[PDB]
């Protein structure tokens, strides 16, 4: 009942299932000598560590949260240092979301992971700037969660890989994400493939007022590799 | 054998063996830290591994720490437990401590955790001409931060407690027996010559 991955280990979970997004794992670049032919360094022992983020607060009037996954780890730790002085990467992720409330709370979350989530501004003709997208570690907040901030409805948002956190039954979710991009290797400082988003469908309630019910998100790059920084001559 | 986690001043009695974690405690606040020093005054002075290894001079081996949570059955929450190698210094914030060797332990699933300490060493180093003492450098730290808040129902009390244990492993070695200063030299014995008369 623990996830010992490298240096750190998130211990003592509830029973959980590795629901692979779609049907695949990271795979480590099977054969491309036609592109960027300086063999990828492929670091493996010094990146896989479950970078746990800040705990967020779930109150009655809360409305949703979103993180951009290559963006949330650009300034954190050993993966954050390899984003500078490298310009190509290739990695898949693993996400473990776990809230904790007693047996007197009630509610439901939708933990969904959205590939290529192009956002949209409400009621204007101007595209979103650089600062409304690259928020960072803190993430963001849905302004209009019913339309997922781009017009496509939430009722059909179960077509993506998703799990439910229903506080009557469970309090944990786990999604494994493969490399979802058209190009074989991508640029980390300006493109964001996945977009982890959690949305409370049924809001919480109790007899007293505004119980926090804090949530924890933990992200770990699975099978990462970068360009080569060391060459013979 | 349990250690004295509550290393603050004015903790008199058997209140040194526990730390309270109240409901009104803000996130990322450090609870304790253990300097891994046997010979020095701290949480590991008066234990079972720190009294046998006073009689000997050189020690080197691996240890094994165990914590235990003594709250009610309903209460939940998370902690985080770091280990600092002997080079670097003690971390002060939670974010600068997560990049070390940590585990993220909660309360609802398990009520006990196990944390292997890899290697320690020590000596006494009387190296000069006169009677001087050269303290060994501080090897290691084990510190603990509050990840999320404590969540109790309306019926349980809002205060919980932790208890820490310690035990050496099966490669802990000792050498060069000396005499321990633990009691004190000599004091008044009430009938100090029962035998003579």
């Amino acid at each position, epitope marked *: 009942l623990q996830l010992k991955l490298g240096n750190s280990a998130i211990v003592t979970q509830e029973a959980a299932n590795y629901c692979c997004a779609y049907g695949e794992w990271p795979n480590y670049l099977p054969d491309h000598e036609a592109v960027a032919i300086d063999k990828p360094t492929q670091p493996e022992t010094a990146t896989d560590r479950f970078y746990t983020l800040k705990s967020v607060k779930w*109150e009655t*009037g809360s409305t949703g949260w979103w993180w951009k996954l290559p963006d949330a780890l650009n300034n954190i730790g050993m993966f954050g240092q390899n984003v500078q002085h490298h310009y190509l990467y290739r990695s898949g992720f693993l996400i473990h979301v776990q809230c904790n409330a007693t047996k007197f709370h009630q509610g439901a979350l939708l933990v969904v992971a959205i590939p290529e989530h192009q956002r949209g501004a409400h009621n204007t003709n101007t595209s979103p700037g650089f600062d409304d997208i690259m928020k960072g570690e803190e993430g963001g907040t849905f302004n209009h969660p019913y339309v997922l901030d781009d017009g496509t409805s939430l009722a059909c948002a179960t077509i993506f890989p998703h799990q439910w956190i229903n506080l009557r039954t469970n309090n944990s979710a786990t999604i494994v994400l493969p490399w979802m991009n058209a190009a074989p290797m991508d640029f980390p400082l300006r493109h964001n493939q996945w977009t982890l988003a959690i949305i409370p469908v049924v809001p919480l309630g109790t007899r007293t007022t*505004s119980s*926090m019910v804090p949530i924890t998100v933990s992200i770990a790059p699975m099978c990462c590799e970068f360009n080569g920084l060391r060459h013979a001559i | 054998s349990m250690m004295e986690i509550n290393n603050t001043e004015s903790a008199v009695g058997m209140e040194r063996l526990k730390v*309270d974690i*109240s*409901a009104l405690t803000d996130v990322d606040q450090l609870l304790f830290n253990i300097p891994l020093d046997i010979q020095l005054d701290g949480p590991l002075r008066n234990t079972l591994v720190g009294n046998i290894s006073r009689y000997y001079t050189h020690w080197s081996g691996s240890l094994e720490m165990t914590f235990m949570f003594c709250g009610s059955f309903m209460a939940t929450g998370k902690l985080i437990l770091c280990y600092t190698p002997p080079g670097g210094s003690c971390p002060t914030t939670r974010e600068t401590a997560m990049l070390g060797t940590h585990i993220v332990w909660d309360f609802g699933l398990q009520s006990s955790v196990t944390l292997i300490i890899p290697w320690i060493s020590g000596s006494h180093y009387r190296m000069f001409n006169n009677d001087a003492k050269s303290t060994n450098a501080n090897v290691g730290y084990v510190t603990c931060f509050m990840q999320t808040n404590l969540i109790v129902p309306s019926e349980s009390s809002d205060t919980c407690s932790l208890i820490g244990f310690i035990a050496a492993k099966d490669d802990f070695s000792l050498r060069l027996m000396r005499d321990s200063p633990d009691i004190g030299q000599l004091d008044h014995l009430h009938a100090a010559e029962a035998a003579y008369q």
Partner: antibody
Amino acid sequence: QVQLQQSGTELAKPGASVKMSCKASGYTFTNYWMHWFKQRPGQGLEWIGYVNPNTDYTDYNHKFKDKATLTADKSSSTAYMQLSSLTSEDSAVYFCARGTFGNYASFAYWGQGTLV
Amino acid sequence: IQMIQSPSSMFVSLSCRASQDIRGNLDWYQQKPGGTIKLLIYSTSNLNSGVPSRFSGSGSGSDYSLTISSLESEDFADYYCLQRNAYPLTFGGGTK
């Protein structure tokens, strides 16, 4: 380090309104409630209300329902409070405190005060 | 709900009643004459991190009190109370 820096003092003729600010720095602003207090000079204090900057829900004391309004800004990290229809008895010092992560009312960090 | 504090001035057990029961849920504050406020006791018996350990609080259903062993020069400050049980939350009168 948690700091609650309020504005300097100001005064106004009766029949007007006034707005103050309690700028906070050193923590994540959208997690804690921002309570506001009132102390007449020489007497005890009194709770006015709070603002929840994660949701912008406010809850007022019943005496101060029509006097004060409470807003909160996320970008500038600053909580405001605007009075209305000032009289002679509004001359007091006004405080600002911080709640807890779990929504409890025990105040460990405070402002310096602002006379009216 | 109204809370009254029985001594009006002090020249060292400062008690305060309550209109109802409050089930713990009481804090003790202090105000320096410069204008700084920090709390001393939270949840009617515990001590804040960074206080001299001579302060202590009693506990009951409705009648709570503070106990100071020894006095000091800058110990001289007006002391307030607070119930956080039900909104609207009310202070007390204060001493000294």
